[PDB]
Amino acid sequence: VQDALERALPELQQALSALKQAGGARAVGAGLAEVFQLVEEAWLLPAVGREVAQGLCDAIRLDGGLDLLLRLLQAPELETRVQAARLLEQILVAENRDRVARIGLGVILNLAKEREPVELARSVAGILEHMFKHSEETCQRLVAAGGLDAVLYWCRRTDPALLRHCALALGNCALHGGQAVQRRMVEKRAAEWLFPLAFSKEDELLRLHACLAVAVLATNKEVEREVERSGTLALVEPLVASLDPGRFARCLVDASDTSQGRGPDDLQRLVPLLDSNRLEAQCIGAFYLCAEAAIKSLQGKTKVFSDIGAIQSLKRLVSYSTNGTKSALAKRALRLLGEEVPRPILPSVPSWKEAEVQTWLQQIGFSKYCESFREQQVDGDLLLRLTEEELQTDLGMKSGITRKRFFRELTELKTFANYSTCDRSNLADWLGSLDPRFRQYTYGLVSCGLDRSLLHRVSEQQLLEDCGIHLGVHRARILTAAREM
Amino acid sequence: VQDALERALPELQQALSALKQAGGARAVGAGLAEVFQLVEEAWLLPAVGREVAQGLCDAIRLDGGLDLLLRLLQAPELETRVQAARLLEQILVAENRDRVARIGLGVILNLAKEREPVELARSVAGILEHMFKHSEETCQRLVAAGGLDAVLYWCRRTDPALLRHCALALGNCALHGGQAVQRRMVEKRAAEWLFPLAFSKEDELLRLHACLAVAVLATNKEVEREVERSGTLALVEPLVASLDPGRFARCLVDASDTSQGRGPDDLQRLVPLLDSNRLEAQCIGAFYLCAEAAIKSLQGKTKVFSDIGAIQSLKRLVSYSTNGTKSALAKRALRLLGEEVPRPILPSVPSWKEAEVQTWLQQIGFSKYCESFREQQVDGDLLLRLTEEELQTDLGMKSGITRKRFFRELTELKTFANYSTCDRSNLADWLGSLDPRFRQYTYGLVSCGLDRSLLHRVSEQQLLEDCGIHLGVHRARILTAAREM
Numbered sequence: 001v002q003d004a005l006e007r008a009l010p011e012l013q014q015a016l017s018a019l020k021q022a023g024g025a026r027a028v029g030a031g032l033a034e035v036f037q038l039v040e041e042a043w044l045l046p047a048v049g050r051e052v053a054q055g056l057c058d059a060i061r062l063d064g065g066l067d068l069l070l071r072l073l074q075a076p077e078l079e080t081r082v083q084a085a086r087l088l089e090q091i092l093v094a095e096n097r098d099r100v101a102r103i104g105l106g107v108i109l110n111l112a113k114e115r116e117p118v119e120l121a122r123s124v125a126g127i128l129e130h131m132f133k134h135s136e137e138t139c140q141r142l143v144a145a146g147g148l149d150a151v152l153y154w155c156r157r158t159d160p161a162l163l164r165h166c167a168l169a170l171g172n173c174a175l176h177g178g179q180a181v182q183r184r185m186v187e188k189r190a191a192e193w194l195f196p197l198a199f200s201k202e203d204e205l206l207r208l209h210a211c212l213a214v215a216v217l218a219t220n221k222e223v224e225r226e227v228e229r230s231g232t233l234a235l236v237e238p239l240v241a242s243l244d245p246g247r248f249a250r251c252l253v254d255a256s257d258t259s260q261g262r263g264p265d266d267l268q269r270l271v272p273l274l275d276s277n278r279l280e281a282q283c284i285g286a287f288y289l290c291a292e293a294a295i296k297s298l299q300g301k302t303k304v305f306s307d308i309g310a311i312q313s314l315k316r317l318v319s320y321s322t323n324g325t326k327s328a329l330a331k332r333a334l335r336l337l338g339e340e341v342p343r344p345i346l347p348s349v350p351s352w353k354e355a356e357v358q359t360w361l362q363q364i365g366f367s368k369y370c371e372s373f374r375e376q377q378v379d380g381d382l383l384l385r386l387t388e389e390e391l392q393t394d395l396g397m398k399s400g401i402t403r404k405r406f407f408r409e410l411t412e413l414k415t416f417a418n419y420s421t422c423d424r425s426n427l428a429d430w431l432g433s434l435d436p437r438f439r440q441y442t443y444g445l446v447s448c449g450l451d452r453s454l455l456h457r458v459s460e461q462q463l464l465e466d467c468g469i470h471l472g473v474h475r476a477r478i479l480t481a482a483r484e485m
Numbered sequence: 486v487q488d489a490l491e492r493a494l495p496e497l498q499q500a501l502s503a504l505k506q507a508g509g510a511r512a513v514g515a516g517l518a519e520v521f522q523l524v525e526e527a528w529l530l531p532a533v534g535r536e537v538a539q540g541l542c543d544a545i546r547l548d549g550g551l552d553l554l555l556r557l558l559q560a561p562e563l564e565t566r567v568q569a570a571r572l573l574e575q576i577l578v579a580e581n582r583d584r585v586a587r588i589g590l591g592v593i594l595n596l597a598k599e600r601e602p603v604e605l606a607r608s609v610a611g612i613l614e615h616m617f618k619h620s621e622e623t624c625q626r627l628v629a630a631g632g633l634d635a636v637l638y639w640c641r642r643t644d645p646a647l648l649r650h651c652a653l654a655l656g657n658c659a660l661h662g663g664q665a666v667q668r669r670m671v672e673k674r675a676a677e678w679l680f681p682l683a684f685s686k687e688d689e690l691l692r693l694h695a696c697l698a699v700a701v702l703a704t705n706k707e708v709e710r711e712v713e714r715s716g717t718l719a720l721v722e723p724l725v726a727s728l729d730p731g732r733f734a735r736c737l738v739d740a741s742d743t744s745q746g747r748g749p750d751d752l753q754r755l756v757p758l759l760d761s762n763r764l765e766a767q768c769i770g771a772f773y774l775c776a777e778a779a780i781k782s783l784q785g786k787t788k789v790f791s792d793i794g795a796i797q798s799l800k801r802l803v804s805y806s807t808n809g810t811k812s813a814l815a816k817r818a819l820r821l822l823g824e825e826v827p828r829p830i831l832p833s834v835p836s837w838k839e840a841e842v843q844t845w846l847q848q849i850g851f852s853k854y855c856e857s858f859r860e861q862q863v864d865g866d867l868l869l870r871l872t873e874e875e876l877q878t879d880l881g882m883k884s885g886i887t888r889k890r891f892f893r894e895l896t897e898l899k900t901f902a903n904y905s906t907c908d909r910s911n912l913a914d915w916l917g918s919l920d921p922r923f924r925q926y927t928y929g930l931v932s933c934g935l936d937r938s939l940l941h942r943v944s945e946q947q948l949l950e951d952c953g954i955h956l957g958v959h960r961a962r963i964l965t966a967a968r969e970m
């Protein structure tokens with residue numbers, strides 16, 4: 001499908017040569033308009049626009065296109081600025097992204113001080129958004145000085161494209177930025193400014209991006225207080241519930257902000273939102289994943305999600321979902337990828353009987369051992385207290401790899417199980433507060449009769465032997481937490 | 486092919502005898518011209534010039550030819566110096582190199598102070614450039630005092646041949662010199678003076694050697710700050726991308742600076758540039774390797790690369806390349822040697838399924854066990870956490886040699902894998918900052934639940950058992966690094 005490359009690269013080289021030869025303002029503007037048209041038609045090329053646009057961006061990278069665009073962007077006249085920034089925001093691929101991070105930092109901030117031209121402001125917002133898509137060190141250095149002031153000022157504006165770009169930029173800050181970056185942004189009242197934007201009924205896209213940024217901020221368990229004080233959290237769920245993934249898929253074809261799909265890096269960033277223990281974050285992540293799933297199915301690719309690994313997260317959500325809209329979104333996405341829909345699994349693992357054990361074993365595809373469990377009368381308690389030796393000898397799992405897979409499944413089930421039948425001190429809640437996966441040990445401690453009050457007097461040997469916590473790091477963390485009452 | 490040897494040895498002996506008998510300036514000049522012509526025709530002898538020139542250099546080494554040239558180079562008249570140095574730069578093989586390093590230090594420097602004669606300066610630059618190929622202590626001593634000033638002054642000159650000699654000299658200083666030598670050169674503003682040279686569009690060779698020196702300096706992670714402040718880094722990639730190795734091969738036949746190939750030691754120095762973790766350095770290394778591959782294939786030698794080991798680096802680059810220019814260069818170089826081009830492997834190693842495992846196993850040529858991997862349902866997580874005993878028993882690799890080979894392949898894959906799916910504290914980035922190979926351990930730490938923040942509270946036993954870091958030295962280094970936050 002390189003015919004388009006042979007169609008565009010000669011014209012692109014000619015246009016780049018003209019742009020380098022363009023010393024006059026009119027010639028600069030004409031060349032910038034031509035290259036902008038070329039990159040736009042490359043982007044909108046049906047079902048193949050992404051890779052051809054990336055190739056055009058690479059061809060711009062050679063011949064020093066980036067420095068030429070920066071040079072034209074430093075010109076006194078605003079026409080050069082607007083045209084150059086319009087071109088640049090379309091071509092800010094990861095390679096050009098890091099090149100700008102290395103070289104062009106500081107001029108972009110200075111021209112971002114030019115908040116008055118809204119037409120320029122939209123393009124500058126796109127530039128800084130794509131910069132936020134870059135690594136975290138760039139996030140601190142840019143967001144600290146040029147980020148919050150410019151993004152908040154343009155959020156206070158009313159133009160739709162600028163607000164949409166600002167919301168996307170804030171979402172990228174929340175995703176690629178560190179917990180310190182999110183903390184600083186939250187302290188900068190960013191959520192409070194986003195609250196009208198998410199409450200702005202005009203555009204669904206702006207509200208969606210604002211909800212995404214709010215959810216990613218809520219993933220930080222240190223600033224969530226003022227985050228929920230913003231009130232957007234109670235707004236996130238009704239919005240995602242009201243919207244239709246199929247409707248969103250049919251739309252955005254005309255408004256091609258994401259019509260050509262979304263970068264695998266962006267989806268990889270989104271995936272952690274599923275296992276975030278925050279219902280709004282999981283809702284918005286599921287909605288985005290379902291929308292991108294529909295878009296890719298229209299394009300005809302589903303392997304990218306498996307490469308990212310969202311399949312496992314979605315299936316775990318389906319098996320361990322209590323909400324209705326989360327279940328609907330996950331099932332719809334899985335059916336969009338042409339994947340099986342697992343039946344929800346009964347959470348009362350401690351009270352499980354043989355039927356539940358057989359069902360769960362068949363669900364993890366371990367039928368070869370099912371009868372043995374049925375032979376051994378395995379129930380919830382025994383399954384929860386199952387050990388390596390018992391699995392190997394009594395149940396005949398003589399291959400270590402199979403035992404490792406079984407213990408991985410058991411770890412997942414333990415982490416996402418409800419122990420309300422047995423515990424009474426909410427030891428599971430405390431362990432999850434320390435770390436989600438720590439919940440895997442909860443029943444063991446319950447099997448030991450340990451209590452929160454008694455936790456400060458437990459020992460390492462008691463943890464390893466009685467509680468069966470094989471990992472030394474987890475034992476050390478638990479002991480350190482328990483020593484502090 | 487000793488016919489050339491018996492053609493040259495008697496004539497060379499006669500010329501050496503005449504030069505020894507030459508007391509007058511005119512006789513000295515005549516003898517020097519004759520021996521220079523002989524060594525020139527010996528070097529340019531088709532496809533066999535190297536060994537015959539080496540034999541001529543050995544014949545000069547005997548009969549005190551080196552000390553005769555030194556004494557003539559100590560003469561008052563400039564003509565004798567220029568002729569003697571013209572001969573010497575051609576006859577400065579490694580043996581003559583070390584002899585001059587032992588004996589002729591300081592007189593060469595003193596005549597290098599005579600920077601005014603540009604024709605003499607060319608030969609002096611050649612002498613010092615070849616001298617930089619010697620050991621690092623000699624490099625320290627001689628480069629520290631005379632080399633820097635002479636090369637900077639001659640770079641300030643306009644002679645293309647002198648400039649090319651200086652660029653090659655700086656590249657040799659960067660390669661053969663130690664980290665202290667590189668630091669001293671960087672402190673001498675070397676890259677800043679190189680910037681106009683690389684920016685001088687006239688000579689492709691001069692720009693290429695300047696970019697080579699810049700890249701080798703950039704391999705140092707202590708002084709790269711001012712190196713990228715020089716600005717040549719943004720120019721390195723366009724140069725290598727624009728040029729064609731075939732163009733470099735068909736050309737330079739007349740300008741026989743490298744038309745007879747390059748010393749295997751030089752290629753051995755070049756190979757580390759491929760695994761230098763810096764895109765520009767790998768680009769220039771790949772370009773040089775492809776050019777030398779073309780030259781050798783035209784000559785008909787490919788085993789030299791296997792002896793040097795560039796095949797492994799090229800294949801690792803091809804498998805684990807994200808850039809297009811590097812991929813194209815490495816693929817073309819491998820096709821020059823008639824070696825298979827491996828298919829690039831999916832970087833999302835944690836998210837691999839059975840098909841990816843089968844593909845990777847077939848790529849490393851471990852087909853004999855693929856079905857077993859299929860039988861045990863090994864996936865990315867299991868493969869990354871696979872142990873010695875599990876491999877030996879479950880997968881039936883009873884021969885420890887095969888297990889060591891498989892674990893070496895797994896170590897390489899881990900070092901070059903992408904863990905962004907699993908980790909979130911960028912622990913891989915920190916480990917690579919400590920040491921690239923340390924990246925192999927990252928997943929294990931991720932499997933242990935360890936992050937950057939808790940790194941300072943890990944212990945040796947936790948590293949050995951939970952993280953499975955078998956090497957005690959690596960464990961000690963990681964613990965020491967973690968103790969310092």
Ligand SMILES: O=P(O)(O)OC[C@H]1O[C@@H]([n+]2cccc(S)c2)[C@H](O)[C@@H]1O
Pocket residue numbers: 043088089090091092093094130256257258260262263
């Ligand atoms: O996520 P990616 O594409 O690697 O990087 C973002 C860059 O791509 C352009 N873009 C992506 C998608 C669809 C359209 S119309 C345009 C953006 O303008 C930005 O420059």
Ligand SMILES: O=P(O)(O)OC[C@H]1O[C@@H]([n+]2cccc(S)c2)[C@H](O)[C@@H]1O
Pocket residue numbers: 528573574575576577578579615741742743745747748751
């Ligand atoms: O070749 P090596 O061992 O890297 O360098 C040793 C000597 O060979 C001469 N030489 C080799 C080949 C082609 C020409 S024109 C010249 C150089 O003058 C150098 O002093």
